[PDB]
Amino acid sequence: FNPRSDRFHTLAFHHVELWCADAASAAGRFSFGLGAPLAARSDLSTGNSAHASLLLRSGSLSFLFTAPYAHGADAATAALPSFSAAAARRFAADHGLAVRAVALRVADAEDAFRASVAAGARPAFGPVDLGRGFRLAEVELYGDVVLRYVSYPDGAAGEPFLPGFEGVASPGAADYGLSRFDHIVGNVPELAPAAAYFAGFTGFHEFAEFTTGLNSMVLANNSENVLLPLNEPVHRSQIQTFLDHHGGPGVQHMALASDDVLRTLREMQARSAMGGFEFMAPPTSDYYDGVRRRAGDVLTEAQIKECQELGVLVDRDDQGVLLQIFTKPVGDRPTLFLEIIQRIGCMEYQKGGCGGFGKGNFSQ
Amino acid sequence: FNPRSDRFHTLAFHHVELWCADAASAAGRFSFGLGAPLAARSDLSTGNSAHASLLLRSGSLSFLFTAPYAHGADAATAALPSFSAAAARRFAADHGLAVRAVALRVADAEDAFRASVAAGARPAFGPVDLGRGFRLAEVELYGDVVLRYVSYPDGAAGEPFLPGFEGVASPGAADYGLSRFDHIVGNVPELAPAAAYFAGFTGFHEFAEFTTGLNSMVLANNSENVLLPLNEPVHSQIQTFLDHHGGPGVQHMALASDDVLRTLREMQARSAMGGFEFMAPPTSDYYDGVRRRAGDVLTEAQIKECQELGVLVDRDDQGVLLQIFTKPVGDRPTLFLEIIQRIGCMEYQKGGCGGFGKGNFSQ
Ligand SMILES: Cc1cccc(C)c1-n1c(=O)c2cc(C(=O)C3=C(O)CCCC3=O)ccc2n(C)c1=O
Ligand SMILES: Cc1cccc(C)c1-n1c(=O)c2cc(C(=O)C3=C(O)CCCC3=O)ccc2n(C)c1=O
Ligand SMILES: [Co+2]
Ligand SMILES: [Co+2]
């Protein structure tokens, strides 16, 4: 059942912004670890004396890393009008490396902002004109994470990012096959008030529910190409550990999709030792006898063999299979981690959520 | 002239520690950018809930990256007893990614501390025993940068780093040939008072002085294997550092390799995908000058490779310096790196062989 109850036209994921201690360090390591070359910048070298922002890109995946300058800063040169230097300094201290903004492209950032706050959204940054048709607004998502709306005409899709961001070419830099954001998951202490608030102001509909040490709900836009789950603890748990160390609600993981995840993972795992991302240790060997039974009709024996070699997990639902693997936490604290995935099947384009989210795997 | 006036036995550089709000990002990028595999850690996984510390090593070169935990942090579990979460949070807000500690191995950290403050050093952390014979002490160097003394018996050497740190094996991880710290440079608004204070409490002796716009003074220990220069601006690149850093601090660290061109080939191969960028190569007429000045030391092939990589060549009395500088290593136009090789002065190699690049201010 899809009621298509979006209160505003929600087109797709646009970017994720991490407010960093040092944007050069975080973007540099993520570039190497993910195979996502630098694609745009706004900083002192482009006339922005308020914040340093670096935009990494792989396929349609856009990661924005932003840090505040401390001295000589003219707040009027910020390419992101919502930026506040003291808020970013506090944010990095409160959390370590952490997602500040989940950004969706909407038909009209002002219309989405107005509809959101009328339906209970706590305003974060009222809509502004970024220039030549670009609009931006923010509302509170959970904790100190904001849901950012950006809008611009389709004819502007050739531009690097947002006004004020200069493009950066990547001639001698190829990617590792990461193609798109699939889902972004938040942890909250109480799912029911947080889901009621968030689904309430967006009109996003329940896509999936898993109850089980967590209770989870997946919220989706009309087309279900925007997937934004929320988790709560039950009652020591993985969700509570996050909340304690993080200091509040926050983004727990971002799932990044590839059309060939085994090839992507071989490249990422070659980088782990020297400063890329380490991955969770592979399951016991009997896990993959299970994979042969549950998915041996759609995965070849060789593919399952590669899955075992690289440690990837396999789950399946009705007519779809999910390959997934998780990184260890990507900052200092046991909080944020990444999920790298491939979805197989549900070609009806591919229907969102094909293969589910890995519920079958929590018996590791 | 070397008066060998050290107030305490100063053995060698031991490590440099950067304070950060995010150690994992900085140590991650430095690891593949410089080719320094992770070699030790102290954090939640080792029983330390106060700070997360990552130790990168390449040869004798050791970089420590430390960030405070924010919630449920028990300061009493810190592996670094001088660590203070409140001071580290202030440090990151004030400076961004920046050097906090320049650490020297001394014969006895307690004696080095006592003799220093007796000679005017502003104390920063009184000497403490870390166990297994390790002692640690800190005095103020300039601004918020401390000079850290560490001492331990030579039968300890095989310990990963300091007590409380757990080794990281990094299975088949390879370095890019960086082998040791050559010198570490601080910027200050006024050279004469800063040097009077610093040379005063250490007994380090003046090794060289230069005028560019900057005035500089190199201080050295007795053996001259520890080189700690200071710059002031001329009333500028130095003032831009002070403005954006918020005060005095470490401007650059020079990292030596026994084969800098091979090292730089590996570092520059990492630039496009998140490694460090380097200052652009000088124009071809500069390298005609290198041929005139250094054709008795470098081959034509080396000079052509220097040009390809952008490395600068300078020379003093019977020594040659090969050096190249990175762009700033973080967001702010503050800290940067110098990658070098020294050629000649084999009498081991005499410290400071070939100078610091005073010639290279014309290119
Ligand atoms: C990575 C890790 C570290 C330490 C402890 C644990 C449980 C895990 N961990 C996961 O966090 C995990 C998450 C999902 C999944 O991504 C999904 C949530 O289950 C709720 C719905 C939406 C979201 O997409 C699936 C499988 C998982 N598995 C199997 C796993 O082991
Ligand atoms: C890298 C960069 C960026 C923007 C502006 C400039 C001047 C530079 N820059 C340097 O900072 C630089 C520093 C030294 C040198 O390392 C040395 C100082 O000259 C004083 C003595 C101790 C110290 O070790 C030598 C050559 C240099 N050159 C050639 C150079 O261009
Ligand atoms: Co997931
Ligand atoms: Co130098």
Q: Is A51 annotated as a binding residue?
A: no
State the ligand closest to the CA atom of B254.
4
Tell me, in angstroms, the distance from the centre of ligand 1 to residue A362's CA: 7
If you write DSSP's letter for every residue of B2-29 in order, what string do you get? Answer: -----SS-EEEEEEEEEE-S-HHHHHHH
First to last CA, chain B: 30
Tell which atom from ligand 1 comes closest to the C-alpha of A361.
29
Q: Are strands B98-106 and B145-151 parallel, antiparallel or unpaired?
A: parallel
> What are B124's two structure tokens?
């920063």
> What are A321's two structure tokens?
């299979």
- Interface test with chain B among A244, A332, A338, by most B beta carbons within 10 Å: A332
Q: Among residues A273, A73, A91, which one has the least CA distance to residue B174?
A: A273
Query: Residues 182-241, chain B: which have Cβ within 8 Å of A?
Result: none
Nearest to A26 among B22, B96, B171 (CB): B22
Technique used: X-ray
Q: Which residues are CB-contacts of A286 (< 8 A; sequence separation ≥ 6)?
A: none
Q: Give residue ranges with CB within 6 A of ligand 2.
A: B 183, 185, 210, 216, 229, 231, 237, 254, 279, 312, 325, 338, 356-357, 360-361
**Distance separating alpha carbons of residues B324 and B332, to the nearest angstrom:** 20
If you write DSSP's letter for every residue of A90-135 in order, what string do you get? Answer: HHHHHHSS-EEEEEEEES-HHHHHHHHHHTTPPEEEEEEEEETTEE
Q: Which residue of A has its CA nearest to B51?
A: A332
Nearest CA to ligand 1 atom 5: A238
Tell me, in angstroms, the distance from the centre of ligand 3 to residue A340's CA: 9
Q: Is B190 annotated as a binding residue?
A: no
> What are B128's two structure tokens?
């403490």
Q: Which residues are CB-contacts of A205 (< 8 A; sequence separation ≥ 6)?
A: A2, A3, A4, A5, A199, A219, A220
> A55 to chain B: which residues are within 8 Å by CB?
none
Strand partners, A135: A129, A151
**Distance separating alpha carbons of residues B146 and B140, to the nearest angstrom:** 4
Strand partners, B15: B103
**B3 in contact with chain A, both atoms CB, cutoff 8 A:** no
**Distance separating alpha carbons of residues B13 and B226, to the nearest angstrom:** 6
- Would you call A16 helix, strand, or coil by DSSP? strand
What are the residue boundaries of the structural domains of chain A, listed by start? 1-175, 176-364
Assess contact for A287 and A318: CB atoms under 8 A: no
Q: Around A178, how many Cα atoms within 13 Å sit in the side-chain half-sphere? A: 29
> What are B229's two structure tokens?
């220069």
**Residue B188 backbone phi and psi in degrees, to 5:** -140, 160
- Interface test with chain B among A19, A20, A22, A236, by most B beta carbons within 10 Å: A22
Strand partners, B69: none
Nearest to A173 among B27, B173, B272 (CB): B272
Strand ranges inside chain A, DSSP E: 10-19, 38-42, 51-58, 61-68, 99-106, 123-131, 134-142, 145-151, 166-167, 178-187, 205-210, 214-220, 227-233, 250-258, 313-316, 320-326, 337-345
Q: Is A339 annotated as a binding residue?
A: yes
Query: Residues 18-77, chain B: which have Cβ within 8 Å of A?
Result: 20-33, 35, 37-38, 43-44, 52, 67-72
**Distance separating alpha carbons of residues B155 and A90, to the nearest angstrom:** 44
State the ligand closest to the CA atom of A212.
1
**Residue B128 backbone phi and psi in degrees, to 5:** -140, 155
- Measured in angstroms, the resolution is 1.9
